Design a protein around this ligand. Structure first.
Ligand SMILES: Cc1cc2nc3c(=O)[nH]c(=O)nc-3n(C[C@H](O)[C@H](O)[C@H](O)COP(=O)(O)OP(=O)(O)OC[C@H]3O[C@@H](n4cnc5c(N)ncnc54)[C@H](O)[C@@H]3O)c2cc1C
Ligand SMILES: CCCCCCCCO[C@@H]1O[C@H](CO)[C@@H](O)[C@H](O)[C@H]1O
Ligand SMILES: CCCCCCCCO[C@@H]1O[C@H](CO)[C@@H](O)[C@H](O)[C@H]1O
Ligand SMILES: CCCCCCCCO[C@@H]1O[C@H](CO)[C@@H](O)[C@H](O)[C@H]1O
Ligand SMILES: CCCCCCCCO[C@@H]1O[C@H](CO)[C@@H](O)[C@H](O)[C@H]1O
Length: 494
């Protein structure tokens, strides 16, 4: 025994969130990830903890109000990686009447009741603004930004903290009920090593693959269809010097964001394109680029071309199929299904689920698995503080406090460590007292001490994990700098 209480198949936001919650209730948990943590949908989002302004249009109050209330919970759980942001909504009366926005903003302000985040206002835009001169009016309100891939990583760490196990580069190949228990089989994608475990409960949190795991892994009927709806984002040198995001109303009624990113760039996204095929192959396409630049170039005076684009990414939303014609009208609320046999071996499956709502998703999932467990602790995550999150304050004021005790750190490296690692920065820096104590410089102040730490404590196995998920250093390192990181990782992980 050898028998885990719970096995979670899935290492994106919904699987890590269920595993964490369960590990902190005393269940012995094993989370399996086929490749890396956040390697799919959860590292491809617009990176927003939002209530979901556009969803009020479709009367989605369960969701918008749940999500609104969650912004402030997440903002206390993970202040290294999440923070407040203001969004400016340019006014276009031919699409939505000023009187309507005004009603929407009120509901946004009061559906979740918020003890910290500011509140909405009107705006006039002059001849000197970033917007084309015909646009003269708007609105401003609040929502939050999170480092998505990192948030998944904070939940993986929380699982290990509470005695859970997290395997990556390990793909579950089947699950079958046998004599009251699950037999789960998995296979290490590199070495071909086989594994086999028994469990009392199973979570299918594989996201875009949820129904495929029923079909191919379990030979069971799925309770819901899934619609894959691709969205892509483009990244450009920052379009302006302001700190606010803009939310733009497009002619098709879908809103597109222009979000400041890393003090240096702007992300523009996203799109809604029905998708068929391997979710691992999703890539942005020509019309998506032309679409995103069009909505941007029709609103802002500084025009962008295709040539300005420095990076793009793309993922598929796994949305619970409510059968709507238009991909943009499909619900973003999640659905959980649970089912047992002879009152044993429950299977919880997750369909849909924003990053915003994951903790509450996870709490609902444990509500449903409780009957199967003892003995089982109560809910507890609303109170906690994710690993890295214990900064006795502000991130700009942990970055100062960090450089005060490690004053060999430049202000840019302190800012990075604080905004990435938070209170884990001391575990990374260990006993270093000079810059040369940090080891090989891999480029852009990404030192061997960081890389070693990522492997030892953040499940890094390949360069992309480190450079695109655990950090966004891949934005600055050249091709030969990146193969060196992979060379070192080969040397170290031997
Ligand atoms: C374009 C876009 C923009 C978005 N913007 C936002 C937004 O800003 N705010 C917000 O809150 N949400 C946003 N989202 C929604 C959000 O990203 C997703 O809802 C969410 O991340 C779903 O995560 P998941 O865990 O359910 O799936 P994912 O986990 O991210 O993917 C499933 C995981 O399961 C693994 N897996 C699959 N099969 C197996 C197996 N056999 N064995 C082991 N592992 C397996 C995969 O490797 C993968 O890691 C956006 C989504 C899209 C794509
Ligand atoms: C009873 C429910 C009232 C529905 C009114 C919804 C108006 C919300 O207002 C607007 O909605 C649009 C898309 O939803 C977007 O342009 C904006 O994000 C939002 O301000
Ligand atoms: C040549 C005459 C054109 C006048 C058309 C007036 C209607 C334009 O549209 C209006 O724009 C205003 C922004 O200032 C807002 O008061 C309203 O929300 C909107 O209805
Ligand atoms: C949040 C409470 C709801 C308030 C009712 C909305 C009234 C706004 O009404 C709108 O205001 C604009 C500027 O004053 C005008 O340009 C529009 O013509 C007008 O219809
Ligand atoms: C389909 C959208 C129409 C909704 C039915 C409500 C009628 C809209 O009527 C509007 O009411 C506003 C106050 O709320 C006024 O300020 C506007 O000038 C008026 O046109």
């Amino acid at each position: 025994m050898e028998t885990k209480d719970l096995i979670v198949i899935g290492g994106g936001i919904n699987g890590a969130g269920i595993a964490a919650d369960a590990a902190g209730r005393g269940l012995s948990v094993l989370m399996l990830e086929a490749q890396d943590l956040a390697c799919a949908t959860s590292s491809a989002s617009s990176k927003l903890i939002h209530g979901g302004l556009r969803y009020l249009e479709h009367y989605e109050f369960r969701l918008v109000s749940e999500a609104l209330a969650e912004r402030e919970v997440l903002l206390k759980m993970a202040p290294h990686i999440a923070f407040p942001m203001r969004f400016r909504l340019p006014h276009r009366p031919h699409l939505r009447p000023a009187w309507m926005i005004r009603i929407g903003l009120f509901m946004y302000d009061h559906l979740g009741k918020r003890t910290s985040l500011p509140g909405s206002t009107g705006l006039r835009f002059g001849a000197n603004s970033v917007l084309k001169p015909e646009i003269k009016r708007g609105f401003e309100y609040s929502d939050c930004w999170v480092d998505d891939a990192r948030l998944v990583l904070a939940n993986a760490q929380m699982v290990v903290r509470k005695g859970g196990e997290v395997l990556t580069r390990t793909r579950a190949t089947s699950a079958r009920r046998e004599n009251g228990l699950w037999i789960v089989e998995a296979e290490d994608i590199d070495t071909g090593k086989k594994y086999s475990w028994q469990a009392r409960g199973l979570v299918n949190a594989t996201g875009p693959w949820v129904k495929q795991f029923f079909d191919d892994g379990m030979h069971l009927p799925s309770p819901y269809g899934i619609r894959l709806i691709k969205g892509s984002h483009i990244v450009v040198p920052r379009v302006h010097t302001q700190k606010q995001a803009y939310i733009l109303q497009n002619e098709d009624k879908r809103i597109v964001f222009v979000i400041p990113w890393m003090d240096e760039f702007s992300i523009i996204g996203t799109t809604d394109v029905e998708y068929k095929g391997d979710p691992k192959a999703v890539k942005i396409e020509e019309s998506e680029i032309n679409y995103l630049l069009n909505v941007y170039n029709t609103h802002f005076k500084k025009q962008l071309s295709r040539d300005d684009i420095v990076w793009t990414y793309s993922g598929v939303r796994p949305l619970c199929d409510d059968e709507s014609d238009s991909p943009q009208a499909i619900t973003r609320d999640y659905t959980l299904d649970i089912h047992d046999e002879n009152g044993k071996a429950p299977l919880l499956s997750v369909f849909g689920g924003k990053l915003t709502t994951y903790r509450k998703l996870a709490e609902h999932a444990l509500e449903k698995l409780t009957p199967y467990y003892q003995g089982i602790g109560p809910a507890w995550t609303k109170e906690s503080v994710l690993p890295g999150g214990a900064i006795e304050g502000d991130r700009d004021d942990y970055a100062a406090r960090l450089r005060r005790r490690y004053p060999f750190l430049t202000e840019s490296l302190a800012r990075h460590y604080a905004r990435t690692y938070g209170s884990n920065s001391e575990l990374l820096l260990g006993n270093a007292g000079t810059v040369s104590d940090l080891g090989e410089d891999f480029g852009h102040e990404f030192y061997e001490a960081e890389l070693k730490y990522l492997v030892d404590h953040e499940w890094v196995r390949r360069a992309d994990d480190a450079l695109w998920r655990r950090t966004k250093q891949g934005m600055w390192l050249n091709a030969d700098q990146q193969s060196r990181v992979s060379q070192w990782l080969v040397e170290y992980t031997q």
